[PDB]
Design a protein around this ligand. Structure first.
Ligand code: F03
Ligand code: MG
Ligand code: MG
Ligand code: ZN
Ligand code: ZN
Lengths: 327, 324
């Protein structure tokens, strides 16, 4: 059920070398992958090697893994290959800034979970699948797509010469598959609200303890949300262009809903585009700002994500009619 | 309504020789014509001679054509004669680095099309013309300015001692005028998006075939867009002074709203320049980077344009973040 890369695809990736000027750039939270498309698989290799080491994974198996993950992402406006690399780069920057708080297993596990977190996404939300009683909704009653993304990751790992974790002990393998399962499942935003409220309580009451596994799982969960939403932490024109992609995907689902005799929520209605700036203000106040605020409290070196998010919350200027030119 | 040039103008250009110091510099994609105002028509003659040969056009007719083309460029802030020569130099560098891919008819057609691409521009976008109901919109319905620029080119070619293509066979003249029309039309940015999307698909699926005329036409169109936007491919001190160019059409319209006693919305207002570096970042990511990426895929020797565009994108980021 998992697509497989060609020998030409993985062989080419093995040869790739990151340009010198990008090495400085890639370490920054605000780094936008957008203008380096041909370099995306190559950028992931580089992040895995700098964070985990060159001998952490067998080069051929990792290059086959990367290229098959690329092939298993669909041609959808937002939950695509670019989004996967974007989310992985944000994880990398959080990891580099908080390196010793995480074990080698968690680091390789989280970078792999970020690259695969939306594998085989169809441009449809859990709301859609659960309403239109799709087989995925019967198979996965809760966090529908997120369980499907995790299943897809396992399926790519099970391909010939794709098991990048083969060199781990049967215990460590089971440990990494669990790190990945919980991290992919934590990308379901329905789970974020409860997770964030719990972390805020643990942090404020001073009970938060990074050596307590249940606490680590929550902090990892918030890191997954933070990386998944990282378009809101880029420079404004980058943020705005990605918001057009997100809405292009939401509106195509609203279109599919109409044909099926059900009217969509305003956010998924292409005839309600005027409601977008207020909806973004609502999303930033209810989700993005609280996420990065709690994450900065737990991991202070992540402070730039919060600053960049407050800067984009630009949406206020848009609502007041002071926006700039589009191309 | 086409304008001719004086005897003194075309004659002075015939005497022109490019200074040696510029012979290798001009071959570079990032070459800036900026400091050489007096040499602009001469630089174009030099480029035609090097690309098409000295026997391509009768010197006198060519020099007459060029001086009339210059005449026919209004004193607008962006879509002026400087722009025309900048665009033509970028076509020269693309053509020279892909020396075996283009026919003699395509090379002469494209350099002339680039020099003539923005003929008699008034500083307004096609959006404004069919909004404020300008007379040009009544003349030309779609790709309003581009249809006008080609009308203006045919208008100049039909003037006495200006048909630089009179030395061609019945079919060859029809072939060249078609290349030019298609090339000037392709400069309508509104057409670029769909063209580039189609080319991406073709290249990726392996269906791109340069033996196929409609495929050549599409590739030529993307080259016209690449040349049209080339200020983004210059060195930083040259590009940093080019920030207001992409805003020229928004501000032209705002100026017209200001003439109706209407303070326009900030994006159309020239006194609101604080968003200019952010507008550059947005234009590079949405327009220029994809253009140069697709162009480099089809024509690998064009890679320096993509590199220089990426370099300036990084400089604009630094400006926004307040690091330079
Ligand atoms: C209204 C709303 O939910 N907007 C929205 N905006 C987003 C912007 C960036 C990344 C993710 C999102 C997202 O999930 N939702
Ligand atoms: Mg997801
Ligand atoms: Mg034009
Ligand atoms: Zn995601
Ligand atoms: Zn132009």
């Amino acid at each position: 059920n998992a697509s497989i890369c060609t020998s030409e695809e993985w062989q080419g990736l093995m040869q790739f070398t990151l340009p010198v000027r990008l090495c400085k750039e890639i370490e920054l939270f605000h780094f936008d992958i957008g203008p380096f498309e041909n370099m995306w698989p190559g950028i992931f290799v580089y992040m895995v090697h700098r964070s985990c080491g060159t001998s952490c994974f067998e080069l051929e198996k990792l290059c086959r893994f990367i290229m098959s993950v690329k092939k298993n992402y669909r041609r959808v406006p937002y939950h695509n290959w670019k989004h996967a690399v974007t989310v992985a780069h944000c994880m990398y920057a959080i990891l580099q800034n908080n390196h010793t708080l995480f074990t080698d297993l968690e680091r390789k596990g989280l970078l792999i979970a970020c690259l695969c977190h939306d594998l085989d996404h169809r441009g449809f939300s859990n709301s859609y699948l659960q309403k239109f009683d799709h087989p995925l909704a019967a198979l996965y009653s809760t966090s529908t797509m997120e369980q499907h993304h995790f299943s897809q990751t396992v399926s790519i790992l099970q391909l010939e010469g794709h098991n990048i974790f083969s060199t781990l002990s049967s215990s460590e393998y089971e440990q990494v598959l669990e790190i990945i399962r919980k991290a992919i499942i934590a990308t379901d935003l329905a789970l974020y609200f409860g997770n964030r409220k719990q972390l805020e309580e643990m942090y404020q009451t001073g009970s938060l303890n990074l050596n307590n596994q249940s606490h680590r799982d929550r902090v990892i969960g918030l890191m997954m949300t933070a990386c998944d939403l990282c378009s809101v932490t880029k420079l404004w024109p980058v943020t705005k262009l990605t918001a057009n992609d997100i809405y292009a995907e939401f509106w195509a689902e609203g279109d599919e809903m109409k044909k099926l005799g059900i009217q969509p929520i305003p956010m998924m209605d292409r005839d309600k585009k005027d409601e977008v700036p207020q909806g973004q203000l609502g999303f930033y106040n209810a989700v993005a700002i609280p996420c990065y605020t709690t994450l900065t409290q737990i991991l202070p070196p992540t402070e730039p994500l919060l600053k960049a998010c407050r800067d984009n919350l630009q949406w206020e200027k848009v609502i007041r009619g002071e926006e700039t030119a589009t191309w």
